């Protein structure tokens, strides 16, 4: 894979617009599923399906739960960074 991080700013609804998928105690590896239209993540053209996320605003997500990561991004405001891995 290729380690990469992009600084995407939050939208009006405090949602960069990006889906993920992961578990816990077996599948702690969180990854991206797809993107939504009219979203900063889509319009920007950086983070989307195929790219595995492994960081946010410098923090580490490789180990957290789906609900944990989701709330993490929703909590962050402004220039939100996402360390995705091109696969």
């Amino acid at each position: 894979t290729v380690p990469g991080k992009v600084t995407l700013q939050k939208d009006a609804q405090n949602l960069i617009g990006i889906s993920i998928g992961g578990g816990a105690q077996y599948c702690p590896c969180l990854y991206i599923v797809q993107v939504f239209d009219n979203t900063p993540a889509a319009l920007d053209g950086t983070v989307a399906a195929g790219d595995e996320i492994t960081g946010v605003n410098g923090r580490s997500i490789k180990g957290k739960t789906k609900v944990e990561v989701a709330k993490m991004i929703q909590e962050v405001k402004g220039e939100v960074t996402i360390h995705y891995n091109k696969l």
Binding site: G17, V33, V69
Partner: peptide, 5 residues
Amino acid sequence: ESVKI
């Protein structure tokens, strides 16, 4: 299932 944020 896919949590969107």
